[PDB]
Amino acid sequence: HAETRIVTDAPRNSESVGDHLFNGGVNHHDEDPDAYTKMYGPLVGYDPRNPTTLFANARQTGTQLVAPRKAREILTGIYSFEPTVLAFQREFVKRANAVAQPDLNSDGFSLNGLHTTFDSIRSVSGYPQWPVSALPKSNVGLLRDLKLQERMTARQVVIAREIWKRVWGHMKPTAIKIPKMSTSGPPRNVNDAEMKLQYALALFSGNRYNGYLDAFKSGDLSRFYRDYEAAVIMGTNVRWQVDNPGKKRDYWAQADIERELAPSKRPITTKVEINGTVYDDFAAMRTRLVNAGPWTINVALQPFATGCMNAMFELYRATWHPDEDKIAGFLEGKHAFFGDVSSYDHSFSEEKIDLSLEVGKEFISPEIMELASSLFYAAYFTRPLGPDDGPQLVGNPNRYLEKQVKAGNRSGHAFTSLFAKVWKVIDTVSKFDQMGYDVVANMDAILKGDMPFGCINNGDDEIVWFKSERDYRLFLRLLETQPQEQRMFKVGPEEGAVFSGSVYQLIGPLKYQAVERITTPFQRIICPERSIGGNFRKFWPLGILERYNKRNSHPVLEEVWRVFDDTYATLMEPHYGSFLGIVQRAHKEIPFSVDDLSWKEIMVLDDPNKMYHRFTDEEIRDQVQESAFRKLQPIFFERMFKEHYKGNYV
């Protein structure tokens, strides 16, 4: 068929989606160019004078806060604002701190496996720090505050081009993941993976991908919206995590980002006060704004992000995807710096984002890179970030071909993870360069782990390793001496040498042993981001039982679990029932068993987005992946790649 539009002139909502189910073998939208139009309803309609109506049909609307205050159900029948729970938190933390204290050397390595104190467990889940910090229109104040370079050096640009050529220039075609449990974002704002899949099939049928790009590049939002159900705009969500009591933090106010491009931050002053009692020894949960790109934008980009990432994991495994179980042994006999990056994604400059996309255009049609740019710099809409704020549109989505919000490696983008991984390695390879090494001539060898130095990467987490002590101390001298003109990101040593959630305990001379942070099991039980069950914690017993079952695997861990069990038994059990009873009864009601799953699989059930950056299809069984994702195999977008990709297939 000739049809170039996803939404045609056919009557909408005239056929049931049940008559157009995807069989995994043929794209039925090739047979019927009107199918998508007929199986879904009329869009509400775009008003350029009122762009926020793009979100008026969402589950949460207008007035309701992005981060409401609401007690969490931490275990069956146990809620986080109850005074007995808070009493347990205080006593558990006293007793756990009496077990062990972090024992760190001058390089930040833990000698006992513990990297910090247990004080963050005095955080009240469901009690947010407010306001949630807004995203300013400009990150220049941050770049200034962090003392980052004004521009890349010439050499840094060379290195960035050499690495991006390797990344964009190779592709291992891989299925698009279609999330079951997240919103499509505008315009439909539904958690409907069937619609997402049918949209993908429509996009990749006939001439619709080129029609989509033509509509995009026209700058006519009314056209892109009408004919492709697409609008370049971010929604916003909030992520929550524990904090250390007493830690001073700051935030960008909604009223300031409205008035100023790069305003200064204001102090967060939230105190925990529950039913008329102040808890001065507790923290409110740290909160962070995350943007969310619409499905109907990200779907056009994801094939490239996923394919290039998967290629990179194969060709340059030693850098971007080593076996995590083997890292500690790999490091035996090596010196290592564990990177702690401050405000990483937000600290990317416009130059860095733009260069990445420029090199992309050598391998991928330029209009696709321009779509990526449009989303990186898109306007966003947020519901209120605090109790005194209103909903707010930041930027002008009517002018989406112009940059609206400059915020570095924008969250919610198809490319966010790829950019995080590649730029951390650009920075570290530039550091190898600044030491004096000839990194261009030896680029492949560095990335493949064949030189006497290299780096293991997981986005903003990294291990920079050296076979030679003298090379290692030269790297440390470089960090100490590096001037502003060379500084890409704000990086220091990680307290306790943590990588991907594990402490790399120093157990002998250049001998390491990985231990999951000993704070983690207790934070995730006692101070959770979300209540048990619901959308995101259906499988909550698994992570707990997995951790409990390995309690004897490390001597500090073992003692802290003994403190948990004894303290819970005395202070919680009389009122709420036994801990293991609650957890084991819940485990019986879910369709997975902890004994049958790998550690990787349990991680993915707790955080499915680890499939976009940490684990590949090969490492996770179908039943686990299918809990969270539908898939579209790459045969269904092969024609798009034949036209629009110019690199090498792996």
**Interface with Mg ion by CB under 5 A: which residues?**
19, 340, 461, 494, 617
- The answer to the question of whether 339 is labelled as a binding residue is yes
Residue type, position 558, single letter? E
Q: What is d(CA 161, CA 70) in angstroms, rounded to the nearest whole number? A: 48
In the complex, minimum distance from the CB of residue 129 to Mg ion, in angstroms, rounded to a whole number: 10
Judge whether 296 and 40 are in contact, CB under 8 Å: no
| Alpha helices, DSSP H, located in 204-267 | 208-218, 221-228, 254-259
Of all residues in this chain, which one has the CB nearest to Mg ion in the complex?
461
Q: Is 203 left (phi over 0), alpha (psi -120 to 50) or beta?
A: alpha
Smallest separation, CB 118 to Mg ion (Å): 17
Which is closer to Mg ion, CB of 253 or CB of 297?
253
DSSP state letter for 40: S
Amino acid occupying residue 17 = V
Pull the structure tokens for residue 144. 């200034």
Q: Say if residue 260 carries a ligand binding annotation.
A: yes
Q: Given the complex with Mg ion, which of 324 and 461 has the nearer CB atom?
A: 461
We find the least distance from the C-beta atom of residue 463 to Mg ion, in angstroms, to be 9
Question: Closest distance between Mg ion and the C-beta of residue 371, in Å?
Answer: 30
Q: Which residue number, 7 or 272, has a Cβ lying nearer to Mg ion?
A: 272
In angstroms, give the least distance from the CB of 264 to Mg ion: 7
Minimum Å gap between C-beta 163 and Mg ion is: 20
Contact 624, 605 (CB under 8 A): yes
CA atoms within 13 A on the CB side of 592: 25
Number of neighbouring beta carbons within 10 Å of residue 643: 11
Q: Are 422 and 169 in contact (CB under 8 A)?
A: no
Structure tokens of 627? Answer: 């809990």
280 is in an annotated binding site: no
Q: Least distance from C-beta 16 to Mg ion, angstroms?
A: 6
Q: What is the DSSP letter of 617?
A: G
For Mg ion, the closer CB: 4 or 458: 458
Is 19 known to sit in a ligand binding site? yes
Residue (34 or 494) nearer to Mg ion, CB: 494
CB of 44: closest distance to Mg ion in angstroms? 26
Q: What is the three-class DSSP state of 267? A: strand
Ligand-binding annotation for 454, yes or no, is: no
Write the DSSP symbol of residue 43.
P
Nearest CB to Mg ion, comparing residues 247 and 326: 247
**122 or 537: whose CB is closer to Mg ion?**
122
Residue 620, marked binder? yes
| Helix ranges (DSSP H) in 482-578 | 520-526, 540-549, 555-571, 573-576
Range 479-484, long-range pairs (CB < 8 A, 24+ positions):
479/337, 479/431, 482/431, 482/434, 484/147, 484/148, 484/149, 484/150
**Interatomic CA distance for residues 367 and 228, integer angstroms:** 16
Q: Among residues 127 and 316, whose Cβ is nearest to Mg ion?
A: 127
Is position 323 annotated in a ligand binding site? no
Nearest to 324 by CA among 456, 423, 449, 520: 456
Q: Is 460 one of the annotated binding-site residues?
A: yes
Of 367, 369, 368, which Cα lies nearest the Cα of 357? 369
Nearest distance, CB of residue 137 and Mg ion, angstroms: 13
User: In this complex, which beta carbon is closest to Mg ion, that of residue 11 or of residue 534?
Assistant: 11
Q: Which residues pair with 632 in a beta bridge?
A: 176
Residue 256 Cβ vs Mg ion, minimum distance, rounded to whole Å: 8
Distance CA 609, CA 417 (A): 10
Which CB, 122 or 644, lies closer to Mg ion?
Answer: 122
- Rounded to 5 degrees, φ, ψ at 288 are -140, 135
Nearer to Mg ion, 229 or 494 (CB): 494
3-state secondary structure of 277: strand
Contact 421, 460 (CB under 8 A): no
C-alpha closest to that of 338 among 105, 557, 164, 120: 105
What phi and psi values does residue 461 have, to the nearest 5 degrees?
A: -95, 140
User: What minimum distance in Å lies between the beta carbon of 285 and Mg ion?
Assistant: 12
Determine how β-strand 123-128 pairs with β-strand 283-292.
parallel
Going by the annotation, the residues of the binding site for Mg(2+) are 19, 260, 339, 460-461, 494, 498, 617, 620
- Binding region: 19, 260, 339, 460-461, 494, 498, 617, 620
